[PDB]
């Protein structure tokens, strides 16, 4: 409904003071030191104001105590008039960290299970393997729809060749080929070369 | 099959001159002959003036160490007033007698330091050069007598051949008085410098 | 003098709200699901004190149903509901909310938090619709129907037929030009973008009927540690970053005070391919308040040099805008940066106590570290501590600078180094003879960005640094050496000038150096100026240019070879021999080529070498 | 049975919403009132257009601003039409009831005025910075009236206060306690310097004694017909619009009428800025005006990136803009303007193409931007090709366009040639051109990296292809006599090729003999596809990216030997005499090393070469 507590904050320094005559590295330290000494002088001021009334505590003494009481009232007034820093708005509640230190049969499994499941299905480059590509080529050689399946075969086979060239796992090396394809003559030449290879 | 250019990081301006004093020594870095003019001096004094004017507005209006070797010039023809230097009894000609008497670097010391650096940058000679003597200890000793009955200021007696900056000479005479009370604020200095720069810029 | 009350015309405000309050179209869905959500936790809170409140239904589900043949949209939810009193004034009043009244009457402590403080949310649905109908059933009131069409008159009635248990059914008629909002892809995209972190399931129906879920992942950062385990962190990382590799570093952050928030930060394993390619607007860190998406595309959120860390930050209260895309008084957004960067930097220390994992971390993120140690003008000192570099007297590994300083010889106040193009070049270069003859250490520099960092790193724990490719190196000798070479200058005095007339310009001062034991001559560069690598790197930048910074040149000569004494004897013989001329120019050419500096015209050198080899051949 | 009611609205929360959570800054409050005076001024003028008798109540039509720091007050005094009791109790006292729209609609069929503002919820922005508002009004009929408010929930209306006034309206603002920063002299001109400069009424400002600065002098010219303009007025308007001291170079006036009416002025600069590619601040060189008010600047989807020097302004009316007055909803409309702006910019360039030394200066200034535009866009290659100029070898100092080179071809060859190097002296005397020079053909030069960047994407020109002189496959049309000469040369030099392959190899794919060298023994050539030496040098140094697999498949070389020189004959005769000696090894390594040095690549280590030549000179001197 109303927002008025967020109208006066001070930044140590961010970007908004760049008069091309002063050096930033010096201005930053000057501002920080000025803020800290202002904090310290106000700090000693509150101690003096406190000690005044504290040592104050007959009618004259009561009047003095009332005057310092109004002085403390003024001190809270100026404190409420003081802007927000970067060192009074938050405290810590808890923290923690973790290093995250790590501690033929596989070929046969990845052949039979993956080939069967992906033949039933037909993320791919994320999961499919060389045997899946071999069975896709097997499906194409059974076929010879034609152009599109050939196109996908060349696309993901080119992905595998790119992975081999980079000597990295293609499981996380598929976005680069697309972001580069979004060379065309070479792609068409390889397309027709593979087409005449498979047809022959 | 194109690297698709982009990502220009620019460059920082190459650091070079480091004291604003070593420039006044060697012709290899900057020739001392016909290259000497007046537009350079009015320009550099103008940048110092506007920098000081901006600095003195905020809460850090007190500098405390107005010193030419603190001032730096880069290779974009720009001037910076930095800290550089980072109890100090370090006596020099550049401090005001208000420090040498009791204490408390304040406004008056800044005005006095501005005056002496302006002197050194216009005349192009040694620090507080006087034709009467050339030894440092007696310089300090005479400064110890600056609170006496006669002032002892940098040599700008007479002869002009230039007229023009007669106003600026009025300022530099103003900066050289024993009484710290009358010393002017930055406003007249920056106004006169801006007007002279404009007169030299509309051409 | 008279006093009069305030007035406000209603008709024009109606068009004011629905035409110039928002900028896009994908927000009415978020508004409707937020309304259903607050109804849900309202009845949920009502339940803990009265079980019988849930007799008209035990399930809490929100569902959306499209229909193309009528071109209609339906939202069904079971919540608190309305009575006749609620329908007349709570909904029929502009800029008034029952949520605030409910929470004010509930002034007995804070246990639940709900959204909605303005009271213009509902009418946003009128942006793309003509007819809106609400069917309402309350736990103690009869079925009621409400209809409106944005004309100035709204209709209420008691409806009959098709009984419901309890709750709200909202039916929206559509336009003719907004058919695109009736397909699966658009609704899935919108729902996953805007309101994908709500603590209740959301389903969708497509017509053999179908049953599917649009979001089935739970918020994680609302539970305290000492209960969460590593596997949950891994699963959350996998779900958020749609990848297959796991994470590398995790950190949890919590604060308090007037400005309170919570944070999760993650550091990955492999570097992204398009990291500094930019172009794509930055989309690393997200900001939320009460689990609704507010702001993204970090602009001042985090510095540019840390644009590789994913994470999430949640707040509790903030001065939002009438339309919930911006944040008023952006200065507050700055403050969190000071509380983020620092804390994140802390992590980089803890990873340094184990050996090989730090090598794995450095190998991919060295460039980010170098850009950081360059640009961060305030925390430079902390960043400079954790660098790792090659060195001469080690093996194939890398050491730390503190370890380097831990072995100063005795009277050594400076640290030397050298920049180049590859390891084998600086390994056997012409500058590294005497510094290994006396016995000392060198630090090798090999990357193009690296040469920027040394430009700003001038000091390190009370010791300065000098470059082995600058004029005026000073290293310790002893009195016999000093007398020996100062009497050496007293011999080549005439020699000291003769090169001056032969090579005229492009040489400033020639002296006899003490850095050569196996090479006659070398070229040295001035103090104020650049090095050769600086010149070639500047020539590499293609989008820039001025000039006028090129540093001066100096030439050195060694007093040990027989070649130089032969030159001295031939020169003192006469000054009119061309043999000294050609051998001096050839020596200068080969020396200038030997020190990285680019050539000027290769034809001269090629012709000279061709003539030499041909004359040696016998013809 | 059924009922039909009407909507109702709450007042307090509506007011709180309209004050505290609608705007993104606090400088707007001056702009709102400054705008909201001019409309009333226009109503005065239009109503006076028909009735001369309204000339007896005042002849001055201005607006004055008076600050006061003893009493902490601000006064805005205007001489507007004002309101009577009915309007004051009716228009100002209610939310969202604008008299401007009613006045516009009531009178029509050939009027000409566009009053600013239609929402009717703007005046209350005066409560952004202040605590009490008071308005004094005397329109033309009854005594003056005063209206006092403090955004509490009840306003006060008062009769004449006894201050004698002729006409107009005064708005008096009681400033808050901390906002005194809006009182000193600087921020006043700072704020009025940005928003409300182009308004059709004079503005003054009073400060003190021993009138002052009028913050407006320049009447905009784009509203006029671009048919009697002259150079001097256009120039001084240019000087006023931007901070500089030089005259303009060329300008363009643009206007589209139809479904969308919009006009524009565009200038090309004179001296290029020194930060034309510096980071931050984005593309910003253009301002957006609607109904003579600035909205926003620096939005990327307005002009293509390769144009960051054109400076001007585009203005229109009848645009849908939101409440905050900082953007434009339904971003689709913004996309249409660029397709016309870029066409007019290209038209201006094409018209400039007729001048000699103006084009010389323009090219010297923005060659890089023109070539970047060539590379980036994929639609205007056909037009941006004609604006390129180059060096050559037949003219020397003076420049040339590709059209002239096409116009003076030799009648037999079907190709175009080029060469990219470091500087002019590198390739003006290199070994790659001798036979072409002997025949008498023309080879164009290239000496900047941006030319390297733009040369890859270019494919042909007027149906002719671009081929390199630094690639395998270069032939010139000659007679078959030379062909059988190379035939028996191949039949006569095969074993030498085998030896040159088997020497140390691992660096050369094949050794061949061709006709491009007449005064050099050896040279290096590249392959039909892949990077050149200059490519590797430029891309090995700049930027941060590091992955050389691409270069690993764009790097391979071949060696060429000229079988005419005496040195080749000598080494060949020693070769067929015997091939197991060491002198042959020394000569071949020296020749390969100097060939690599002269080619343009970088030696892996110069120390070995230096040691070899040093040993040679040591033996020569007989030590
Ligand atoms: N589906 C719903 N179930 C229950 N109450 C509802 C529903 N839709 C609206 N309401 C009621 O409507 C009122 C809120 O209307 P409106 O959406 O305009 O305000 P809001 O809650 O502030 O908006 P928002 O949360 O979208 O910012 C409340 O009284 C709320 O109970
Ligand atoms: N000083 C004035 N003299 C005459 N008419 C005025 C004056 N101030 C306001 N009005 C009129 O009172 C009505 C209130 O206008 P208000 O400021 O609320 O909105 P607006 O005119 O639509 O917007 P804006 O302030 O952006 O122009 C309008 O009809 C306006 O012309």
Residue numbers in the entry:
A (entry chain C): 2 to 58, 89 to 134, 142 to 160, 178 to 199, 206 to 243, 249 to 266
B (entry chain D): 527 to 612, 616 to 732
C (entry chain B): 12 to 218, 276 to 613, 617 to 690
D (entry chain A): 11 to 220, 278 to 690
From the primary publication:
Largely, cGMP is produced in response to the activation of guanylyl cyclases (GC), a class of receptors that contains both heteromeric soluble receptors (α1, α2, β1, and β2 in humans) and five homomeric membrane receptors (GC-A, GC-B, GC-C, GC-E, and GC-F in humans). In addition, the PK domains of mGCs are regulated through phosphorylation and via association with heat shock proteins (Hsp). The chaperone Cdc37 is known to assist in the Hsp90 regulation of around 60% of active kinases, both in soluble and membrane receptor form.
Here, we report the 3.9 Å resolution structure of the GC-C–Hsp90–Cdc37 regulatory complex. By replacing the ligand-responsive ECD with a homodimeric leucine zipper, we mimic the ligand-activated geometry of the ECD, while reducing complexity of the imaged complex and increasing stability. The purified sample had a substantial portion of imaged particles for which the native regulatory heat shock protein, Hsp90, and its co-chaperone, Cdc37, are bound. The resultant GC-C–Hsp90–Cdc37 complex is a hetero-tetramer formed by one resolved monomer of the GC-C receptor bound to a dimer of Hsp90 and one Cdc37 co-chaperone. As observed with most Hsp90–client structures, the bulk of the complex is composed of the C2 pseudosymmetric, ATP bound, closed state Hsp90 dimer. The C-lobe of the GC-C PK domain packs against the N-terminal region of Cdc37 on one face of the dimeric Hsp90 core, with the N-lobe unfolding through the dimer core to interface with the MDCdc37 on the opposite face. In our structures, we see that Cdc37 is displacing the N-lobe of the pseudokinase domain of GC-C, binding to the C-lobe at the N–C interface, and guiding the unfolded N-lobe into the Hsp90 dimer. The Cdc37–GC-C interface is relatively modest in size, with a calculated mean surface area of 689 Å2 (as calculated by PISA Krissinel and Henrick, 2007). This interface is partly driven to form via charge complementarity, with positive contributions from a cluster of arginine residues on Cdc37 (R30, R32, R39) at the periphery of the interaction interface interacting with D609 and the polar residues Y580 and T586. Here, GC-C residues 528–544 (VKLDTMIFGVIEYCERG) lie across the upper region of the Hsp90 CTDs, which form the floor of the channel. To our knowledge, this is the first structure of a membrane protein client of Hsp90 and the first structure of a non-kinase client of the Hsp90–Cdc37 regulatory system.
